[PDB]
Enzyme design. Structure first.
Site, PDB file in Angstrom:
ATOM      1  N   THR A   1      -6.176   6.482   8.112  1.00 37.85           N
ATOM      2  CA  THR A   1      -6.715   6.762   6.786  1.00 37.85           C
ATOM      3  C   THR A   1      -6.668   5.530   5.876  1.00 37.85           C
ATOM      4  O   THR A   1      -7.044   5.658   4.706  1.00 37.85           O
ATOM      5  CB  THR A   1      -5.911   7.858   6.074  1.00 37.85           C
ATOM      6  N   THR A   2      -6.167   4.396   6.383  1.00 38.91           N
ATOM      7  CA  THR A   2      -6.351   3.151   5.630  1.00 38.91           C
ATOM      8  C   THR A   2      -7.153   2.191   6.477  1.00 38.91           C
ATOM      9  O   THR A   2      -7.143   2.270   7.708  1.00 38.91           O
ATOM     10  CB  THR A   2      -5.028   2.429   5.368  1.00 38.91           C
TER      11      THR A   2
ATOM     12  N   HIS B   1       2.066   9.089   1.468  1.00 34.10           N
ATOM     13  CA  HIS B   1       1.039   8.942   0.452  1.00 34.10           C
ATOM     14  C   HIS B   1       1.437   9.873  -0.692  1.00 34.10           C
ATOM     15  O   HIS B   1       1.846  10.986  -0.386  1.00 34.10           O
ATOM     16  CB  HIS B   1      -0.336   9.356   1.006  1.00 34.10           C
TER      17      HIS B   1
ATOM     18  N   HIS C   1       0.850  -1.196   0.000  1.00 34.75           N
ATOM     19  CA  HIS C   1       0.000   0.000   0.000  1.00 34.75           C
ATOM     20  C   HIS C   1       0.884   1.245   0.000  1.00 34.75           C
ATOM     21  O   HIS C   1       0.547   2.253  -0.638  1.00 34.75           O
ATOM     22  CB  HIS C   1      -0.901   0.053   1.238  1.00 34.75           C
TER      23      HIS C   1
ATOM     24  N   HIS D   1       5.500   6.606   6.928  1.00 34.48           N
ATOM     25  CA  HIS D   1       5.227   6.232   5.557  1.00 34.48           C
ATOM     26  C   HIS D   1       4.729   7.505   4.886  1.00 34.48           C
ATOM     27  O   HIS D   1       4.592   8.538   5.550  1.00 34.48           O
ATOM     28  CB  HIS D   1       4.142   5.132   5.464  1.00 34.48           C
TER      29      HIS D   1
ATOM     30  N   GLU E   1      -3.254  13.567   1.567  1.00 37.11           N
ATOM     31  CA  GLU E   1      -4.553  13.124   2.079  1.00 37.11           C
ATOM     32  C   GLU E   1      -5.300  14.310   2.666  1.00 37.11           C
ATOM     33  O   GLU E   1      -6.414  14.635   2.246  1.00 37.11           O
ATOM     34  CB  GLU E   1      -4.337  12.032   3.120  1.00 37.11           C
TER      35      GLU E   1
ATOM     36  N   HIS F   1       3.478  10.713   7.106  1.00 40.12           N
ATOM     37  CA  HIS F   1       2.795  10.403   8.340  1.00 40.12           C
ATOM     38  C   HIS F   1       3.788   9.712   9.265  1.00 40.12           C
ATOM     39  O   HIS F   1       4.216   8.580   8.933  1.00 40.12           O
ATOM     40  CB  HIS F   1       1.622   9.449   8.025  1.00 40.12           C
TER      41      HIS F   1
END
Ligand SMILES: NS(=O)(=O)c1cccc2ccccc12
Ligand code: NA
Ligand SMILES: [Zn+2]
Length: 257
Positions: A195-196, A93, A61, A91, A103, A116
Site C-alpha cells: 500500500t506504499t 498506519h 513514512h 508497522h 487502510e 501490518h
C-alpha cells in the site's frame, strides 16, 4: 518525493509508480455482505514463539519494527497460503483523529489505525526477490480501535520518543508480536499489493475480522512522531494511510460465517 501530503500524497503516486492504477491494488473496502465464505480455507497458523526483534526505525513514512528473518523463527502459514512466510517487519498506519487511520475499511468503516505484519515467502530466498513475485508476500492486517489499552503495545509506544524524526533508529530486542494479536484469527483474504510505493502486486492480504483495542493515550503517542528529519520543520506523522482502491476483478474470501 512520495508521501502523504497535499502535494505528494496517494493521488500523486501514479506519476512515479504507474502500477498505482493497476489491477490488484490495496487497500480495499471489505464489503462483508459480498465476501464469499470459503469452507475450504484453513485456519491461519501464526508461529511467533521464536521471534527475534532487532530494531525500530522511523523511515519517514511510519515506524518499522524489524525482525531477524535469516532463519524460520516467526512464520505465517496455513490460512489461504501455500508456503511458509517469514516475518520481516511490522508497522502501522494511523489517523490525525480516532475516526480514521486504517487502510482497509469494513463496510466503509474506518478504524483508528491498522497494524501490518509483513512476511515473505521462503521459497524466494529473500525479501528483495519475493516482492518481485505475485505470491511473494503475505501481510497480516489487524485493525485498531480506541478503547482499553493494549498492554503488549506499550513497549512500542514507550520507545517512540527515541525515534521521533525520519532516519532515527533504536535497538528493540525481545519484543513479542504475539501481544498485538486479537483473540480470534478469523480473517478475510484477497490478492493485492503493497500500500506504499513501489505498490508492487505481490501481496496475499489476510485481514483479521477482530480488531484490537488500544488506548487514546497509546494512539496519541503515535501522533507525536514526525515525518521530517531532525532539524527540519515539524510535520506530525499522522494520516499515513492510503484510501481504499477499486476492487476490480477480485473476490474477497472469508474464513468464517
Ligand atoms: N503497507 S504494506 O503494504 O504492508 C508495506 C509497507 C512497506 C513495505 C512493504 C513491503 C512488502 C509488503 C508490504 C509492505
Ligand atoms: Na542467522
Ligand atoms: Zn502497511
Amino acid at each position: 518525493h512520495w508521501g502523504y501530503g497535499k502535494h505528494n500524497g496517494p493521488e500523486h503516486w501514479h506519476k512515479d509508480f504507474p502500477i498505482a492504477k493497476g489491477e490488484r491494488q490495496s487497500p480495499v473496502d471489505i464489503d462483508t455482505h459480498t465476501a464469499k465464505y470459503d469452507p475450504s480455507l484453513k485456519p491461519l497458523s501464526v508461529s511467533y514463539d521464536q521471534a527475534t526483534s532487532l530494531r525500530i526505525l522511523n523511515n519517514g513514512h511510519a515506524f518499522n519494527v524489524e525482525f531477524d528473518d535469516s532463519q524460520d523463527k516467526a512464520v505465517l502459514k496455513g490460512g489461504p497460503l501455500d508456503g511458509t512466510y517469514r516475518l520481516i517487519q511490522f508497522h502501522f498506519h494511523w489517523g490525525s483523529l480516532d475516526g480514521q487511520g486504517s487502510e482497509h475499511t469494513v463496510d466503509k468503516k474506518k478504524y483508528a489505525a491498522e497494524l501490518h505484519l509483513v512476511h515473505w515467502n521462503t521459497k524466494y530466498g529473500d525479501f528483495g526477490k519475493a516482492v518481485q513475485q505475485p505470491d511473494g508476500l503475505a501481510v497480516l492486517g489487524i485493525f485498531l480501535k480506541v478503547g482499553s489499552a493494549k498492554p503488549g503495545l506499550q513497549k512500542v509506544v514507550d520507545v517512540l520518543d527515541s525515534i521521533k524524526t525520519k532516519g532515527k533508529s533504536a535497538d528493540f530486542t525481545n519484543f513479542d508480536p504475539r501481544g498485538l494479536l486479537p483473540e480470534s484469527l478469523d480473517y478475510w483474504t484477497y490478492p493485492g499489493s503493497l500500500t506504499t510505493p513501489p505498490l508492487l502486486e505481490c501481496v496475499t492480504w489476510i485481514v483479521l475480522k477482530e480488531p484490537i483495542s488500544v488506548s487514546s493515550e497509546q494512539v496519541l503517542k503515535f501522533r507525536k512522531l514526525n515525518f521530517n528529519g531532525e532539524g527540519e520543520p515539524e510535520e506530525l506523522m499522522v494520516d499515513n494511510w492510503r484510501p481504499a482502491q477499486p476492487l476490480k476483478n477480485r473476490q474477497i474470501k472469508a474464513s468464517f460465517k
